[PDB]
């Protein structure tokens, strides 16, 4: 979960299209991050987990599918330093904290 | 106990299948058909066997798995059924509910066909095996049954949920009957004590079909690691002053409310059925009657306790 | 072909009945109840046989008949059925769909009950009879059926329309199933070629009700005389220079526009009409069988709630007696 | 007797017929547009075409007793109207045919 | 009170209509269509009014009438409704629910159309009239309502039964909701006290239809004369030694059992539907739940009384 | 006409698949699951497109094709549908009922979803395409439909059979609705006269599933070559005196009788077959929607009974304490 | 309710036809009377009333329908001397007693 | 290779084919009635007529490894059988045709 992976505008801008269409290229770093947290929580539990993040970083947008070991390593590195309550989930408290 | 979500031993929609046509961190074989919404472990065809097994082994002292599944049949009699395994190695093929025999672990069998002719089926049977006992398919494993409950899980209006918990050498199988869309409406089905399973094992699901045919769909499989409240180290001074969470939470609630408000007028900015809605209303009415009766039972148990306290004086 | 409307063999609303309660140019018999909106040929009662026939014989070489009807029943299986006849003599009373047997003509039977036990009902059966063949009621007339088609015409949100066209010795039955309110959405059902019918015959429509009960209502019965495009004499030089037709057409259109504009502000100037949309008048049978069940729950809920408060009071007052004594 | 001019030009019948829906009685109308009102009010199907059934309903009528015409008689007037006004042999009567006679 | 059946003021199937096309001892007029099974007082057509009134006048101090009827509608809104009258003279025509206005007696109105726009309909309204008050059709007679209950009687799976009892200057209307085929499952709807009606009057039924159309069928109308337990003279020594009844009853029971046995093997000597049977099972289940809840209420009321008796000590 | 069975363009059970899991003389693509009993062209999953086409081109002047299929869904409204094609090239993948658009041939579409919103689905639509017309999916192809008929082919107790016959430039589609187990109870659906199709083309059948889910199973696909009664050469003097035919027919019949008699006593000598009647495999959808409701009651009853005994005990023991104290 | 009206065999014999068919022309006077009591109780309450008796004596087996006053008089004469409990109903105790 | 006499007269294959339903193995059958058993057991539809699909199922078979015949090869044997045995050009094979060769 690098900073530039979440602080890019075109991905989220083409992502919210279909239900909400407000083109505005003056978003704060805490705005597009919030949108990123909102749309990737598919279960509607206002919470991010390993599967949702794994589908986030792979996605459907050509490039070869990533290695299972590499995906496991990167998601374990993400969950190791970001999760604070050791719940297996990632909240926006932990997400914005790191 | 404290619950930790484990993504490595879990699959869930709506993005269950990756781009290459496989489920992450799980290995499927046989007639299992993985889709985005669910995995069809055994389609409604004659002589179908399927299984989805985890790739990496799990080292969990105490665990909890929540499995959501549907068994859909055209007729009133179905075969063969579903199975949830915690084993030592992935079978991935075999005659025991679509998986191998002589498994080293615990298998929960959702048997739908009565091969013993005793009208007990459909049943949920807990069978453990060290690796030297063959599963008795001809009589639904009644002689080797550690525990069994008689619940129906076929053609329910809502997906059937099942919580299997192994916490301090006892295995508990709780079943949602599938008459309500709530995901936390579990009911007690069976339990066993002093259950011994290997600490290293693979989680898996499987399904088999005989002459009669059902669709055995699995929508989700959430594996949770359970840790004791005393053995877990706290490691304090890691919440970062606890104030940023309270500074962020109300702002995020306000933004999600305003996003809902934006979606409210953008739903109608640029644009259920009768009978189906009536069926939903009927099922909601049945659920409300059930909840009222349960509440009355709880109030009468409180009445019980209070009368006994007065009796003691 | 060329169509000419024939009033003497037709009836329609909303003034179907006269001041004396009879249908003009038509004679009704049996259990038929002619109203202003429709004719209830057979009400939803046990053993009802009704018929409405023409008074004067019709001598048409080719003809077309449009029938608008509803067959409404409480249950999914209905009885007995409807029938549209072009016969030689009248069929006021009898056992064949409320009409007499041994008829010399053609009868299109809308059968709603499967007496043969072949699961081919409801159906539209074309039966021609020279006057010597009895209708086989117990086998749904499948042995002597000239043609058949398997359509459902019961319990529809809109009235069911049927076209029976005799043209060049071919009788074609086309059916509008009544799912849509379109009056020109017909679909082919059946046809009989080289069909022989009497040159002069009486039109009629009858309905019978058996063990099960349905209402068989008829809203309209429009008869058209069909003439071949080549055999019809044009008789020209009768349009009177055709200019006043164009001088009157735009005047008539302007009158329609003015009347519509006037009605636009007088429909809302004093709004007092209650109104009745088609959504509030239609409900499926099975949906009804659900709704009552839902209502059956709403009673039980009440018997919980009262019971609930009863347990509540055997809480409250007891505590007082608990509190006072101890 | 038949589709006479005075039967259509009767302003009182037209005014008492348009009541309820057309709430504007005005006793100055020319003998032209009351024929339009007659034609529009006696066409129940909304197809802007007068057939024998609608004409028979208009001729027999109910206005509040009076004896009803015989079926043979009503057939006679309707057939006399159709034989002398239905130029295109359609069975229906257009507005141009109505204004012709 | 003691009940005496009165045939003269009653009609009932399955032979309701005689050979000449009329119901015995009753006069019908209007759009009422008498049949063998039932009387269709108002068919499902626009602007229909019907009524069936008794021929001879009834001299009953206290009486009880049990009326079985169905109101069947295609849509969810119906008009106009049914009415049961105890009057002094037969109206047989009029605008008040198919019967005359200014009636001298009591009229129970089963109103199905809400002309007042207050969502109270369908309702069962008891209106008495000496003969000088016009029924207010434009507001369902809410100003002149002696008593009213809000019960639904339209499109029920079973015929709706109604017991109207006038016993010692009080009129009680009890209604079977029509969800059970039992003929003795009445529920309290309304009552009025100090009700004055003439001792001479005609019993009758009527129905009216407006723009929306219902079928108003009456299956039976049983009129019972109620006499006080003390005012009735016993006239003893008329049972003829009471022994012949006990000598005959068991023989007749044995013969009816043997007749049932004969019919048992003659039913199959020379020879319900799925879904309809399921609907019947569902309604029986709902009725059994209702009966269980009522029994629990009665047991808890017994509990109530017993605790209070203990409280008194 | 004269019919000749063509094995090279046909598949049937109960040995539909070979040892390697492929259909002989047929190529399958997409989400098709060829089994021994049938071919599941589109399973009841979201966004499934499958097709089974012929490997070798068929050059028939006139032909007849019999298709036995089932469309089974949980809900009353299904998606997407089935299609039977006689095309020029193969249609393994595409958006038109699981097959490619812009085809040069004829496609009979069994549509189960009404995208046009006209309440005319499910329907059998005959669409001919020379290779330049795109299929209008959002309007159910009603604009470019050569013919149509309104039949229901979903959730039947018996498989639905369809006959597509091309004979003398006339394509006739007849439909057996599957209410009866008769294999020769066809009913007329539609016909197209002066239909133009390529002389050589590939047969195929495809299925697509949309938002709603149905299983589209195909049990058989029988292809017949049709020859005119006058154009077929008889080639006589090939029966070889016809006498041994009669000498073998009664021997074959006697063998059938002997085998049936032997099976008569060996079916009951050691009775071990469980059996599965058709009554235990069929249930209506709405009836199912009732049965679950009934099951929903059977839970509630239990929660009464336990509760009942609880009140009962707060009777019993209390009496004892009532009895002892007073 | 005269004796010969109930003690005739052909009426009841053609009446029980359809469900039970046992032709036996040796019935006791208490047998065909019992059958008469059994079939005319249409409601299945094992009890006879005024309406059932009125439909019994009129029936559907030509002859002009009887006068309403005459029917009322004969049924009132029947109910006056046969009913003993004054219930408005006629039981086989009262039926066989008179 | 094709519909040879030894392929149909193999008593062991017939006996192992009729097992389960016909529980009576007897090793004295003449070469006549085993052809009847072959024809009856290879007609799955019950119509007493052998078509190309049933013949292909019989020729390819599964008996418990062995390699499968090519599709062109199987087409060759089936077409050779149909071209030399189907006398009436029906596509189906009657018992008289089967006994002819
Ligand atoms: Ca989440
Ligand atoms: Ca966390
Ligand atoms: Ca089993
Ligand atoms: Ca068992
Ligand atoms: Ca019939
Ligand atoms: Ca039939
Ligand atoms: Ca008109
Ligand atoms: Ca004209
Ligand atoms: Ca009202
Ligand atoms: Ca009101
Ligand atoms: Ca479509
Ligand atoms: Ca459409
Ligand atoms: Ca009785
Ligand atoms: Ca008595
Ligand atoms: Ca065959
Ligand atoms: Ca042959
Ligand atoms: Zn007028
Ligand atoms: Zn073999």
Numbering used by the authors:
A (entry chain H), G (entry chain D): 41 to 101, 108 to 144
B (entry chain F), E (entry chain B): 42 to 312, 324 to 365
C (entry chain A), F (entry chain E): 42 to 367
D (entry chain C), H (entry chain G): 39 to 102, 108 to 144
Quote the study's own text.
ERGIC-53 transports certain subsets of newly synthesized secretory proteins and membrane proteins from the endoplasmic reticulum to the Golgi apparatus. MCFD2 is a small protein composed of an EF-hand domain with two Ca2+ binding sites, and functions as a binding partner of ERGIC-53 in a Ca2+-dependent manner. From the amino acid sequence, ERGIC-53 is predicted to be a single-pass transmembrane protein that consists of a luminal carbohydrate recognition domain (CRD), a long stalk domain, a transmembrane (TM) helix and a short cytoplasmic tail (CT). Here we present cryo-EM structures of full-length ERGIC-53 in complex with its functional partner MCFD2. These structures reveal that ERGIC-53 exists as a homotetramer, not a homohexamer as previously suggested, and comprises a four-leaf clover-like head and a long stalk composed of three sets of four-helix coiled-coil followed by a transmembrane domain.
Consequently, we determined the cryo-EM structures of the head region of full-length ERGIC-53 complexed with MCFD2 in two forms (forms A and B) at 2.53 and 2.59 Å resolutions, respectively. Two different forms (A and B) of the head region are determined, in which the positions and orientations of the CRDs relative to the S-H2 are different. The superimposition on the central S-H2 coiled-coil demonstrates that during the conversion from form A to form B, the upper and lower CRDs rotate by 4.8˚ as a rigid body. Consequently, interface-H in form B is formed by interactions between different residues, such as van der Waals contact between Gln191 and Glu228’, while interface-V is almost maintained. These results suggest that interface-V involves tight binding, whereas interface-H is variable. As a result, the vertically assembled pair of CRDs can rotate to a certain extent (by 4.8˚) as a rigid body.
